């Protein structure tokens, strides 16, 4: 078998920079390699084949070189649209094998989150459970802290967070924090607040609602 070792596993770069991804084959593969771009939530698309032949229709900002065991994909003039994971594929010998992929992220100016809080649906509360959601919209950098406070007492253990992939347009992230409670414990308290701390905010932003 042929083993493809790809590096780096992930990288961060600024708009207009030049980024290079490398795949190393376990032995010479005589340029029988192709590269692919996979944008978030999408399927891979062809970029280069035969190590250095650019697919007609793909931007000239992509370039491929290599011989023997070492092959490179170079991406010049990095744009926000290029946020994706890039893979190699060797067609030298079956079974065809892929590199582990390089996750390419974009560095941009700091952007603060727009914070929103959502109380539980009346529909779900009839079923006996209550979900309170806190939304942090279009912020950068990815790092952020979200702390729940019920009756302004810190709450922990009953929340799970989920974060989107980097936006292809503004290179920002969005985050959801979901606090889930029984209706009984939900009705035990009155104030529900989401305290958010982030680079782009002067001070921690707190959004709250009162039950009733």
């Amino acid at each position: 078998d042929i083993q493809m070792t790809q590096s780096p596993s992930s990288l961060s770069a600024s708009v207009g920079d030049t980024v290079t991804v490398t795949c190393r084959a376990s032995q010479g593969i005589d340029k029988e390699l192709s590269w692919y771009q996979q944008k978030p939530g999408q399927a891979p698309t062809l970029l280069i084949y035969a190590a250095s032949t650019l697919q007609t229709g793909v931007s000239s900002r992509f370039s491929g070189s290599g011989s023997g065991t070492d092959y490179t994909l170079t991406l010049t003039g990095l744009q926000p649209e290029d946020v994706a994971t890039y893979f190699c594929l060797q067609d030298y010998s079956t079974p065809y094998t892929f590199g582990q992929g390089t996750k390419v992220e974009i560095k941009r100016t700091v952007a603060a989150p727009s914070v929103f809080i959502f109380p539980p649906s009346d529909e779900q509360l009839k079923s006996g459970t209550a979900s309170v959601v806190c939304l942090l919209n279009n912020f950068y950098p990815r790092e952020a802290k979200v702390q729940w406070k019920v009756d302004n007492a810190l709450q922990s253990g009953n929340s799970q967070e989920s974060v989107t992939e980097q936006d292809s347009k503004d290179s920002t992230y969005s985050l959801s924090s979901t606090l889930t409670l029984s209706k009984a414990d939900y009705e035990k308290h009155k104030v529900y607040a989401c305290e958010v701390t982030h680079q782009g905010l002067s001070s921690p932003v707190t959004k709250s609602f009162n039950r009733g």
């Binding site: 029988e32 891979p44 084949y49 893979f87 079974p95 892929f98 529909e123 959601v133 919209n137 799970q160």
Partner: protein, 218 residues
């Protein structure tokens, strides 16, 4: 417009057989080669096998031993994959993809959108969709809660509303069921006039749920 589309996602019981189909449009499967590839976070991309219709010749990744077979249907422009004795290790996004072979070089020029297949000893369950009621820009969304397996598709107003939509990755609950939210930011001007419905599609369960989101009132 060469296009490829895999069968809809679903659940495959443990030890039973995983079956998928790719519907090809814009090109005849009577030329070039036709592959099945799967993708997992930890294993990356895995080539399963290739298929050449004219001669019905088939080349498989040995790692699948003899669990796999790939066949075609030249008048329907479909080719299929079957993987017997399915196991939790076969949960993955499966891609159908065309492979071109010019001289010594082979590459995958057209991929399908991919379809998630989940191997599980449990049963499907449709999602409960609850509104995320809003309150110069407001935010509203839908809470797609308690469903199995992944995935759910979410649109807004049957695709009319696109800009500003964020469908978050699903979270695994202690329930064993998945839950996610989909949000959209709109002008606060339009909350009382414009209607907002999230179209949730849970293909594993053949369950579509449509829910309108309005500001709660007194």
């Amino acid at each position: 417009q060469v296009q490829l589309q895999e069968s809809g996602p679903g659940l495959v019981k443990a030890s039973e057989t995983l079956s998928l189909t790719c519907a090809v449009s814009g090109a005849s499967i009577n030329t070039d080669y036709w592959n099945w590839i799967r993708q997992t976070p930890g294993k990356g991309l895995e080539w399963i096998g290739r298929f050449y219709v004219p001669t019905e010749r088939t080349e498989y990744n040995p790692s699948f031993m003899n669990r796999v077979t790939i066949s075609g249907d030249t008048s329907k422009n479909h080719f299929s994959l079957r993987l017997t004795s399915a196991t939790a290790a076969d949960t993955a996004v499966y891609f159908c993809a065309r492979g071109l072979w010019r001289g010594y070089f082979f590459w995958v020029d057209v991929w399908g959108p991919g379809v998630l297949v989940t191997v599980s000893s449990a049963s499907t369950k449709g999602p409960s969709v609850f509104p995320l009621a809003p309150s110069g820009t407001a935010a509203l969304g839908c809470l797609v809660k308690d469903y199995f397996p992944e995935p759910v598709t979410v649109s807004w107003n049957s695709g009319a509303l696109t800009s500003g939509v964020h469908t978050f990755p699903a979270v695994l609950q202690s329930s064993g069921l998945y839950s996610l939210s989909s949000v959209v930011t709109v002008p606060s001007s339009s909350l009382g006039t414009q209607t907002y419905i999230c179209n949730v599609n849970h293909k594993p369960s053949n369950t579509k749920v449509d829910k309108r989101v309005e500001p709660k009132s007194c």
